[PDB]
């Protein structure tokens, strides 16, 4: 795939998890099959976050985790939202069911193994 992608799909204990990097890029209006199109970030050093404005280009409803403990946010099909990726992690964990944010820690640990 192109270098611009930063996206992993994996199965864990019977459910699928999408791990989205804060540096994922798919150009809006790409002719390729797109999943999370949107421009590159707001990167303000005064902020503990990097913000990405992305569209969910699918028929999936996601619960999105960027830290733990946290209540997830909900990302419906075709909607454009701003995700606040934490500078600590620079990933978001996406699931199609309401998981507990402890799932985030599982992937955060694995990122640096």
5 a known binding residue? yes
112 a known binding residue? no
Site string for Mg ion, 35-74 (x = CB under 5 A): --------------------------------x-------
64-76 burial, b at 16+ Cβ within 10 Å, e below that, comes to bbbbeeeebeebe
Contact between 105 and Mg ion (CB under 5 A)? no
Contacts to Mg ion from residues 67-86, by CB under 5 A: 67
- Cβ-proximal residue to Mg ion, closest one: 67
- Nearer to Mg ion (CB atom), residue 75 or residue 89: 89
- Nearer to Mg ion (CB atom), residue 67 or residue 96: 67
Taking the complex as a whole, the smallest distance from the CB of residue 1 to Mg ion amounts, in Å, to 7
In three-state form (DSSP H/G/I as H, E/B as E, the rest C), the secondary structure along the chain is: CCCCCCEEEEEECCEEEEEEECCCCECCCCCCCCCCCECCCECCCCCCEEEEEEECCCCCCEEEECCCCCCCEEECCCCEEEEEEECCCCEEEEECCCCCCHHHHHHHHHHCC
Contact between 90 and Mg ion (CB under 5 A)? no
Binding-site residues from annotation: 5, 68
Binding-site residues from annotation for Mg(2+): 5, 68
């Amino acid at each position: 795939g192109p270098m611009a992608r930063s996206l992993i799909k994996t199965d864990w204990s019977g459910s699928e998890y999408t791990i989205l990097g804060a540096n994922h890029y798919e150009e809006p209006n790409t002719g390729a099959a797109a999943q999370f199109p949107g421009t590159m970030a707001e990167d303000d050093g005064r902020s503990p976050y990097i913000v990405r404005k992305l569209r969910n280009s699918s028929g999936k409803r996601f619960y999105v985790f960027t830290d733990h403990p946290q209540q997830p946010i909900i990302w419906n099909p075709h909607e454009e939202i701003e995700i606040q990726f934490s500078r600590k992690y620079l990933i978001a964990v996406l699931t199609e069911f309401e998981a507990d944010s402890k799932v985030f820690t599982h992937f955060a640990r694995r990122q640096h193994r």
